């Protein structure tokens, strides 16, 4: 879709203003260089204590997790160890 | 003490013999730069699910835990953003 999404993305506050299409997957790699994040650990977005999947649309979150447009949609993130 | 303290480490398992003169700082500092964690991030070491003053020294740990040397001295650790 041509439409813009506004959401929130907090560790398990900063808010945005994005693309619909973007995913998961861009997100996670936006995380990783505002936050620096080494290669050393993984990020997990989440809905509510759920990841995601990286292909994950936000608008297909929006319609996953039934989203009524009421305030931004709430991302969270966490890192943990990878190996 | 000129003794030698074993312990583990993991994220809340690697093994360590250490001087048990060393802190908890040094620790935070070791694990900073073993998995490369930006100042973007702080580093909580804990015992069990608390986390210990920076100026703690590993005997301090076994003192106030009062670990009896049945293995070896459990570490968690854990990274919040700071700000």
Same mark, same amino acid.
């Given at each position: =879709? $041509?439409? *813009?999404?506004?959401?929130?993305?907090?560790?398990?506050? @900063?808010?945005?203003?994005?693309? &619909? &299409?973007?995913?998961?997957?861009?997100? @996670? !790699?936006?995380?990783?260089? !505002?936050?620096? *994040?080494? /290669?050393?650990?993984? *990020? $997990?977005?989440? %809905?509510?204590?759920?990841?995601?999947? =990286?292909?994950?649309?936000?608008? =297909?979150? &929006?319609? *996953? %997790?039934?989203?009524? @447009? /009421?305030?931004?949609?709430?991302?969270?993130?966490?890192? @943990?160890?990878?190996?």
């Amino acid at each position: =879709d $041509d439409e *813009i999404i506004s959401l929130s993305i907090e560790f398990f506050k @900063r808010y945005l203003r994005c693309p &619909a &299409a973007m995913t998961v997957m861009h997100l @996670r !790699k936006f995380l990783r260089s !505002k936050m620096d *994040i080494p /290669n050393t650990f993984q *990020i $997990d977005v989440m %809905y509510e204590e759920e990841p995601l999947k =990286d292909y994950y649309t936000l608008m =297909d979150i &929006a319609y *996953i %997790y039934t989203w009524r @447009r /009421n305030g931004p949609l709430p991302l969270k993130y966490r890192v @943990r160890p990878t190996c």
